[PDB]
Design a protein around this ligand. Structure first.
Ligand code: MG
Ligand code: MG
Ligand code: MG
Lengths: 128, 121
RNA sequence: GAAGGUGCGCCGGCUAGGGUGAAGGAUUUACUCCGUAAGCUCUGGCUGGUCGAAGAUACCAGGCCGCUGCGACUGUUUAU
RNA sequence: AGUUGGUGGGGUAAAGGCCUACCAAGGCGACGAUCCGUAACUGGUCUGAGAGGAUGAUCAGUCACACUGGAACUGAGACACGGUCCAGACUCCUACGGGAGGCAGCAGUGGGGAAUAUUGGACAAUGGGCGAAAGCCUGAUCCAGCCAUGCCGCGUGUGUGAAGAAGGUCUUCGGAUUGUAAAGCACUUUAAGUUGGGAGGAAGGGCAGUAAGUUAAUACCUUGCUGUUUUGACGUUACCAACAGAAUAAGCACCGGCUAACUUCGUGCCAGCAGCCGCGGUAAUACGAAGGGUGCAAGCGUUAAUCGGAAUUACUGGGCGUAAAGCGCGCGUAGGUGGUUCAGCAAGUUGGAUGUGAAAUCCCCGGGCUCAACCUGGGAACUGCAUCCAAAACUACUGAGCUAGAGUACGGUAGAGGGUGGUGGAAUUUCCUGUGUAGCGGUGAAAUGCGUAGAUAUAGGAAGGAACACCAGUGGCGAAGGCGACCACCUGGACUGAUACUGACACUGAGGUGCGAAAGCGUGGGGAGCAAACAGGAUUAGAUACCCUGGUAGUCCACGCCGUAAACGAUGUCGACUAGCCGUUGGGAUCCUUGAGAUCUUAGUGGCGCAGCUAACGCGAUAAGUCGACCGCCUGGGGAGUACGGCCGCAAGGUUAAAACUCAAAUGAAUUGACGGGGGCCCGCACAAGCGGUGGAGCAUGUGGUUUAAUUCGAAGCAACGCGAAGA
RNA sequence: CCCGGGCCUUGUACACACCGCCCGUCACACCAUGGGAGUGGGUUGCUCCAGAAGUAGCUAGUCUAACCGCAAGGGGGACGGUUACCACGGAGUGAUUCAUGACUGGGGUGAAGUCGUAACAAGGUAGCCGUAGGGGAACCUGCGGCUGGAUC
């Protein structure tokens, strides 16, 4: 309703508790772009956009040993409290093993790349 | 809890009132004894504790414990009172420092002499 | 009118408006309407000076406050 | 109300209601004005992992003050600490007419307090004022006096030394412990003492000469050198040598757990200890003492205070079904947050640069005190602000759209949704009449009561009020409170199907406003049953109750008020997602077109249940699971949802809402046991049926009581009393 | 059905285990506090009176070195007077805060006294919530609501 992005993570998180294979939900620039980071990071197998006037976003999910690959996904920059960090202040999820997706001005992209690119932005969510 | 509810009204910190209000942020005060008496402790204990009512230099009237065995204090005696209450004595919240001004130290004390104002022999 | 306080006479200088009102104009229809300078008349404002012991100067013209009993109140009554 | 602007003038070093004249009615305030209490502010300091919390000594920057109030004068600079004038309080002098003073400068005194120091030396250094200079003043400053007040450093000896000396303590009486600890033998002597030597903090000044500059000048003067003489308060210096001798130097707290460290003796709920748990009532590791040990050490403890632990105000980083906590429930203002696409902008956001963010301190690397404390070099930091330059993923804004949210148009469906009027049946009560004759009514049983004046019962008639049996259903509708006879009228919403339309118009919501059971209150009606109060009868030791007989307000209606409930699902609203299974209400679609069931879908309404959550109970698509927006609320129990004040009310009262004091717990869930005037099953001379007894009588025995010189002592419900006693 | 006992289940605020726990009034003591005719202080608002010195404006007047001048006297100044501002002080009337006050109300703590036994089991009339009335007291009763009630 008032946070379509957090709807994406919770839809993903609920499915992995229920051992579902694919999920469907309306798409957007942020939803598709965050799916880009997740797929290139290996947390999701693949994502497609059903290009119609009302587009969906479909994610097929990954399980390694039955346990879902994404152990935990947590929203950070909620609409009630938008969170902005500098390059030095960007979070490190689980000591660098995880990824904290940060929407910088060079597109949506991970915290590891943001430090390399030397740009901060809005810390959207943390993954592990 | 909501971050918006906190913005309007910040979290409030209670300040506990001192358990020694008559001492008034001082380590000790000087007072005179208005009444020396003995009182009975609560349910578990049974004894005759020596407590004296002290009129402090700031006008406060309080009762403080007299520690040790035997005391030489009576009416119109200048004493120094320190903090710390007595749990089995109702209404007593101060201690009388032995070995200062009129209240002499306990006689024949050998262990823990400094706490009771006892000379070294 | 709780209580309590300030000003107040007289003479100037400046100044704001009522009313009435020949003219003139209009309806130059008529016991008509609008309006009108001066003159009379009423109400102010801002300043200055001045006399006395005293300016609501005489006559005239609330004393006031606090607690409490009774009757709610205006009224009526033992003409004497 | 000079209040807020404007205009003219005045005034200031300078703008300005700074002042004034006139004109207008403005200005600030839930983004907290105004008022009350407190308070100098900052760099910084303490604590903390940090975020934060507490605080504003020393030192530094700013400010304000100078016995109290006010005022100006001079001056570049003051409305002036050691300046002026006036008024006031105090102290002092006086010849009574008048005068003098301001230690919150440095010492010092009296006083207050728990508490904070010498009536010191010198301008030697660095500054300041004056002066051409010499030089003078400087209680600034540099030093010295006192104080373990704090930080740091050193010492109070070193090795050997069994005799395991003596004594003390404990003891199992063997011994252990004090204990290499002492004694003894060797040894060094920091520091302290005495003596001797001994820097540096000193830059300079005077004098004379020389060189340069200048001027017409070789003079005067300025500057650079040369030689000489002089300046150290502290200080009798830091520092260095020699002598002597272990010689001059250890105390404090604690030992039950938290917490490192135990025995004995004395006491015996007394004395006392105590931060909490708590200890002590006759064999105390918890009191007092001794020995032993522990920790610390020229310090050791206690208090007072801050932070931490305390995630116990939770931003980092808590909760609200039952532990404290979801407003009774809607609507809605400010605010907070907002579906999706394109483009622009750049406030947020990001990176960089520049200026600033005083110095000291914090931190990092070094340097100097024999090291350290301390000083100091450089760097880092000051997480901030301002400007500029780049970027456009997201937010904000702008412009243009889209239909997923929201809403409108149409047909239909169900409903105790609400309001206004009528109408019906059953029943109760009251009254009238007939029959008819000793009870009716009530209770555990009675009695009050009703009845021979004819009750109850039965039949016929009449009046009146209230509620709507069956239907009826974890059924329906409503925001909640609530709504049950039927019909007519007025009217709200929901559900349902497709198409059509707007195009984010949304969510939540402090204030605010509206509705809100029952009781209650006001005015007027009404009143059958029921029934607070009240009366009588019972029961009971008593019974201001339970039970019975009556019975008033009230319950009913209209119009007002109240504004509270265990107003509960003890669960705020809205949106999305997450296995299933079994019912039910209103629809829709497809198979069955079935006659008559089945499968999907939707809005409700229930019962199980995977995962997940939970302290547990339990929740579990109607979440208390995974999230997001917003709001309300909680911070131990009692005091207390009380007092006081405010608002509301006719009142009763409601709402908002403390503190002192007091307690170490209140509390939730669950387990074991025990218990129940809870339930189920079963047994025993437990009951039931009987046999014979005790208690009545005389005698034997024991016990209590009494008495005694003793009537020896113990046994005290069952489970003591012909008991120990199987024999005074 | 009386007593005692055994098993299962249920409720419990009991664990000293119902010979339990526990409520309230009254009697006594102590402590803190509310109300209270009042009484005594602090601070402060408003409306006024007052007006020393000083500053500025005006001039009943008196005096006067710098300038001008005829050497008369002018210009300017000083003092005096006077007005404006204003401190002290005074008056009235409020507000607030502190301390006390005969008496009075509740609250807490007590070594335990009197009267009951209200709740906890179906606590022996299920309990509790709101409200109203009543009663020495816990409490009782009515009306509505709830289960945070036993048996079934
Ligand atoms: Mg009288
Ligand atoms: Mg009368
Ligand atoms: Mg008469």
């Amino acid at each position: 309703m008032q946070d379509p992005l957090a709807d994406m993570l919770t839809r993903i998180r609920n499915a992995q508790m229920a051992e579902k294979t694919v999920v469907s939900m309306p798409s957007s620039k942020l939803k598709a772009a965050v799916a880009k980071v997740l797929k290139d990071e290996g947390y999701i197998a693949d994502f497609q956009i059903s290009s119609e006037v009302k587009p969906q976003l479909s994610i097929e999910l990954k399980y390694f040993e039955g346990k879902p690959v994404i152990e935990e996904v947590k929203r950070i920059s909620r609409p009630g409290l938008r969170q902005y960090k500098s390059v030095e202040q960007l979070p490190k999820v689980r000591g660098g093993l995880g990824v904290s997706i940060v929407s910088t001005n060079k597109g949506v992209m991970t915290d590891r790349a943001a430090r390399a690119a030397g740009v901060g932005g809005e810390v959207l969510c943390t993954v592990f | 809890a909501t971050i918006n509810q906190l913005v309007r009204k910040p979290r409030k910190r209670m300040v506990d009132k001192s358990d020694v209000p008559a001492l008034q942020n001082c380590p000790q005060r000087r007072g005179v004894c208005t009444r020396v008496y003995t009182t009975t402790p609560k349910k578990p204990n049974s004894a005759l504790r020596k407590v004296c009512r002290v009129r402090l230099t700031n006008g406060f009237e309080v009762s403080s414990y007299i520690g040790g065995e035997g005391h030489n204090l009576q009416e119109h005696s200048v004493v120094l009172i320190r903090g710390g209450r007595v749990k089995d004595l109702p209404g007593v919240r101060y201690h009388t420092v032995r070995g200062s001004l009129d209240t002499s130290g306990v006689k024949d004390r050998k262990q823990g002499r400094s706490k009771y104002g006892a000379k070294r022999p």
